[PDB]
Amino acid sequence: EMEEQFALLLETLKNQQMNEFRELFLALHIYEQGQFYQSLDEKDRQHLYNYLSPKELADMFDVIEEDNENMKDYLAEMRPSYAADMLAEMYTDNAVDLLNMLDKSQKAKYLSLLSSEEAGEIKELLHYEDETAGAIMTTEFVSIVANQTVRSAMYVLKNQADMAETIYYVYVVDQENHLVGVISLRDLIVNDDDTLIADILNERVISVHVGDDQEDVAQTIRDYDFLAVPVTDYDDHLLGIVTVDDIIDVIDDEAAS
Amino acid sequence: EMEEQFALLLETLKNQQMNEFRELFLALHIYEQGQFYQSLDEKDRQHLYNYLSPKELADMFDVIEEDNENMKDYLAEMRPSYAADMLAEMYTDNAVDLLNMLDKSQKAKYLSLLSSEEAGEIKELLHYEDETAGAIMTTEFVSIVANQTVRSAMYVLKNQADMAETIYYVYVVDQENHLVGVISLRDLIVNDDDTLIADILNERVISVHVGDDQEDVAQTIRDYDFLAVPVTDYDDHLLGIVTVDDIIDVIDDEAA
Ligand SMILES: [Mg+2]
Ligand SMILES: [Mg+2]
Ligand SMILES: [Mg+2]
Ligand SMILES: [Mg+2]
Ligand SMILES: [Mg+2]
Ligand SMILES: [Mg+2]
Ligand SMILES: [Mg+2]
Ligand SMILES: [Mg+2]
Ligand SMILES: [Mg+2]
Ligand SMILES: [Mg+2]
């Protein structure tokens, strides 16, 4: 089981077998990657930073509990530049959370190490009040325009949607980024290449307001059985999405409360 | 906003304009369909049974919360054959849940009114002890074999879209139906149509056992952030899937 695999992994790590390590580590689901990593002593963590790129390390951090508390120093032991690149690769919702956990000093220092484009989304979402949709949503969603074909929509997905949180829902917006429709991937794939998105999209797209209370958001997810839900401002501008995996954590919090 | 839509609907009922009703009703998400239905009296409800086919009504009952002390009455007030056909169209996990909320007699009643095939999976999952994986899983999952092209896989996916519980995780089983791997529709979409499933499938497949406690299943879905999780027996035979939307109800239950 888990034990066996981790043991082999620890050995490739010590013997500094970079490629063997990478193959094994990267074969693990990001949650298992997190457990393995959270078991390592400070020495082995360092080696690990040498065999994984900031993007790869970010995939794992996305799921490590930011309240862990051993944060601060996980990031501290990292070369500031490396940490910053890693924060810039995590999903925005997770990045914002990490930052709000570090001491007020670290937060600005790491944030300072990022370019304008790298910190852009992180800076917007930091503004949202804790426990509101804006505070638990993320920016990596897929949006397209109506007067496009499925062939065209499907091209974005295949060659231009690697950064997206999820592609299982495709949101349709107009030029001003107004949310005007939605189409699930499962409805999309069964349509002809030439069909126009505008002809098969759903006009009754359900969304929440960026200032709504997480509990209300959770209720929407609970009622509609959605794996994600779009977030907008009063003007209906698509700002982000809240995913079911995070809502579960929210639900866990409300209960324990 | 929602109160208005419902008004235009209730109106098509008092007017008995089947076509107009169906176009407005079927435009709603099944949850809103459920609320509309649940706010009707005996007679508009009856009208609804006339304007909706069993599988259409099933699409809605799938999300109607059993334990609602009305199922007994909802099913009772509708034509036996109609109600039976509606059970056969609901997703298996939900059909089993509804049946177990009905009087031992009624359960037998509708059960007997179903063909061997219509009731197959229903009767299989009916024997699973309450609160175990088997008791909260469903059978409408998509499985494929490792030695085929992505194109072949996609072909199967499109055909299952309409019936499967979900097509976002595709399970790979062997000739004997042993769970050997898994691949997400997302990975399929970004791979070349020529690529062989066996070359891109994930070997480390996470699963749970039919007898596992729902709480443990809930924990697994919580940690791995899964939309669904496969269920097997001790011999690794893929028996079904437990989806995230249902695990949330489990979690609500486990809480207070
Ligand atoms: Mg977190
Ligand atoms: Mg947050
Ligand atoms: Mg639900
Ligand atoms: Mg959505
Ligand atoms: Mg998230
Ligand atoms: Mg139910
Ligand atoms: Mg229990
Ligand atoms: Mg059940
Ligand atoms: Mg989780
Ligand atoms: Mg279900």
- Domain ranges in chain B? 1-128, 129-256
Please tell me the number of the ligand nearest to residue A125's CA.
Answer: 2
Q: Smallest Cα–Cα separation from B251: which of A230, A59, A252? A: A252
The Cα–Cα gap between A114 and A227 comes to: 31
DSSP symbols for chain B: -HHHHHHHHHHHHHTT-HHHHHHHHTTS-HHHHHHHHHT--HHHHHHHHHHS-HHHHHHHHTTSPTTSTTHHHHHHTS-HHHHHHHHTTS-HHHHHHHHTTS-HHHHHHHHHTS-HHHHHHHHHHHTSPTTBHHHH-BS---EE-SSSBHHHHHHHHHHHHTTSS-SSEEEEE-TT-BEEEEEEHHHHHTS-TTSBHHHHSBSS---EETTSBHHHHHHHHHHHT-SEEEEE-TT-BEEEEEEHHHHHHHHHHH--
> Nearest-CA neighbor of B238 among B173, B145, B147, B182?
B173
Q: What 3-state DSSP class applies to A233?
A: coil
CA atoms within 13 A on the CB side of B14: 8
Residues of B with a Cβ under 8 Å from any A Cβ are 27-29, 31, 63, 154, 157-158, 161-162, 167-168, 185-186, 189-190, 203-204, 206, 221-225, 227, 244-245, 247-249, 251-252, 255-256
Asked if residues B181 and B102 have their Cβ atoms less than 8 Å apart, the reply is no
Facing residues of A178 across strands? A237
Q: Of A31, A206, A244, which is closest to B244 when you measure between CB atoms?
A: A244
Q: CA distances (Å), A126 to each of A83, A111, A147, A171, B3, in order?
A: 18, 12, 34, 24, 36
- Class at the top of the CATH hierarchy for domain B129-256: alpha beta
CB A75, CB A69: distance < 8 Å: no
* Chain B residues inside the 8 Å CB shell of A247: 248
B225 among annotated binding-site residues: yes
Give CATH for domain A129-257.
3.10.580.10
Contact A93, A140 (CB under 8 A): no
Break chain A down into helix, strand, coil percent, rounded to 5: 55, 15, 35
Please tell me the distance from the alpha carbon of residue A170 to that of residue A150, in angstroms, as a whole number: 11
Q: What is the chain A residue with the closest CA to B205?
A: A29
Alpha carbons B15 and B8: distance in angstroms, whole number: 11
From ligand 1's centre to the CA of A54, what distance in Å?
A: 18
Distance CA B114, CA A195 (A): 39
Residues of A with CB under 8 A from a CB of B: 27-29, 31, 63, 154, 157-159, 161-162, 167-168, 185-187, 189-190, 204, 206, 221-225, 227, 244-245, 247-249, 251-252, 255
Whether A186 sits inside 8 A of B168 (CB atoms) is yes
Please give the CATH number for the structural domain made up of A1-128: 1.25.60.10
Q: How many CA atoms lie within 13 A of A25 on its CB side?
A: 26
**Tokens in use for A105?**
């000093």
